[PDB]
Each structure stands twice: as structure tokens, then as C-alpha cells.
Symmetry: C3
Subunit: 90 residues, 3 copies
């Protein structure tokens, strides 16, 4: 019905990422202290969750995008978004 | 049908905040080690996400509240809740 | 019928937990740096959120599981999942 969001943040600036699932597409908005901008994340899904962790100053993000019973993990490790090994039996 | 929640926590006590979206209104329950109480956050939304970060011992919280395609950011930085600069274009 | 997910992570290995609400049941998938495996968490809910915090190297997790207007908190504190004191009046 309404759009569905997930958010994560890191450091003390801070950096924030907000994922929005909207009519079966998930997009990303980004804050690194200098204003909101559109991020590179673009994947299909009706539902989104996210978690992230720092290794020093390098951010690692995992976005979990679901359509039906299939959840697909997407990984940011500094070098673009790549499909992760996550599987489930839903 | 069911209500929809988002949660964040910080420190080692810990402090926890649970946001619940219910029939278009989001409310807040709080734990700081001494029992659950109703927090000050009260905003419209059908969907809620949240993230938080520490700057030293000072907590900062961002709650993302959505109704239809409009997501509104709310900010706690120690001194009450204020509308954030987040915009999307959904 | 789309599933709904929540995620948390900790440390820098990292450890990740992904909770999936699916036809009124919430299940758990786990990563601690080897493969993905099925976790012990199994509770009723149409909606799930989660937060976690470290006390030293010991993980503490709180999962908020909602069915209708009733949100139930589940606690991992290193030995097993136990019902938490969380209440709300939804
Ligand atoms: C630098 O690129 C921005 O930040 C990264 C951590 C990701 O969230 C990416 O999609 C976004 O466009
Ligand atoms: C190195 O493996 C990648 O990162 C791990 C933290 C997990 O998210 C895994 O599913 C992913 O493919
Ligand atoms: C001190 O006030 C309590 O904690 C703050 C961090 C906020 O979550 C606020 O809504 C709540 O009432
Ligand atoms: C300083 O700006 C405020 O805090 C930032 C971390 C962002 O959440 C932004 O939208 C908000 O207006
Ligand atoms: C050791 O047990 C595994 O990890 C714990 C932190 C919990 O996530 C539990 O459900 C899971 O099976
Ligand atoms: C010790 O109390 C347990 O842990 C706290 C951090 C809260 O989650 C509370 O609801 C729970 O019963």
C-alpha cells in the first residue's frame, strides 16, 4: 500500500542510507554530511532490510531484497553492488 | 493486518527505542534500564524505519516515516524531535 | 504473500542475522563468517524488527515480533531466546 523503508548509518558525520521499496523497485537515498543524493542501489523487491558494519573507515552494507518468498542479498564492499551468498528456504 | 515496528539501541545498558506504526500513527516505547515507558515521539506514518549513532555519549536518532509515497525524516539530537532534510521523490 | 525481513550485524567478521516473517511465522538465518545456516529463532509474527548490542564480545539481540496489535519481544543474551518485558498498548 504505502512505501516501505529501511535505514542504516555509520561513523559520526554521519553517513546515512535509506532504502525505499516502491511498487516493486527498491531505490537508495544517501547522506554523507553534504545534502541528500540518489545512490547507486537499484534492485527489484517488495520488501527491504539492511545492516552495515565498518572495517576502519570502509563501509560494508548488506541489503536484503524480497519478492514473494525469495530474498536476495546485495553487498556493497566499496566497489559496487554484488549479489551475496545469502539463501533461505521460505 | 498487523502493526509494524522498527527498533534501535545504543550503549551497553542498553537504551532501546521501539517505534510502532499503527493505523497511520507512529508511537514510541523506550527502555533505559529501568522499565518500559512511552516516549515523546508521535508522528504520522503507515511505515517506519530507524537508525541511530553515538557521538561520544550523545545519541542521535533518525526515524523515517512513510504515508503513501511521502517519506518524512524525524531527528532527535538531544533536544527534541525536528523535521529533517531528507527528501526522496517517490 | 511477500515475506518481510529484518537484519542486524555485529563485530567485523561480521556476524549477521536475518529474520524473515512468512505466513505468520518468523525464522532466522545466520552468518558468522563461514556459510549461511538456519538459526534457533522460531516465533509467530506477521512483522519483525530487530536490534542488537555488544557487551564486550557478548552479543545481545532483541527481536520485536508483531501479530495484530500485539508486539512480543524476544531476547538472546548468550544462552537462549526468552520472552522480554516489552509491552505496548496498540
Ligand atoms: C559512494 O556511493 C554511495 O555510498 C555507498 C556506500 C553506497 O550506499 C552507494 O550505493 C552510494 O551510491
Ligand atoms: C564474503 O561473503 C559476503 O559477505 C558476507 C558478510 C555475507 O554477507 C555473504 O552472504 C556475502 O556473500
Ligand atoms: C529523553 O526522551 C526519550 O528518549 C529520547 C532519546 C527520545 O527517544 C524521546 O522520544 C524519549 O521520550
Ligand atoms: C544535519 O542534518 C540533519 O541530520 C543529518 C544526519 C540528516 O539526517 C539530515 O537530513 C538532517 O537534516
Ligand atoms: C548460537 O545460536 C545462534 O546464534 C544466536 C546469536 C541466535 O541468533 C540463535 O538463534 C542462533 O541459532
Ligand atoms: C533485562 O531485561 C531484558 O533486557 C532489556 C534490555 C529489555 O529488552 C527488557 O525488555 C528485557 O526483559
Amino acid at each position: 500500500s504505502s512505501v516501505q523503508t529501511a535505514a542504516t548509518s555509520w561513523g559520526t558525520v554521519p553517513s546515512i542510507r535509506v532504502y525505499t521499496a516502491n511498487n516493486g523497485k527498491i531505490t537508495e537515498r544517501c547522506w554523507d554530511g553534504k545534502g541528500w543524493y540518489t545512490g547507486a542501489f537499484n534492485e527489484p523487491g517488495d520488501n527491504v532490510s539492511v545492516t552495515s558494519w565498518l572495517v576502519g573507515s570502509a563501509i560494508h552494507i548488506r541489503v536484503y531484497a524480497s519478492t514473494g518468498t525469495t530474498t536476495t542479498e546485495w553487498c556493497w564492499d566499496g566497489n559496487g553492488w554484488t549479489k551475496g551468498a545469502y539463501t533461505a528456504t521460505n
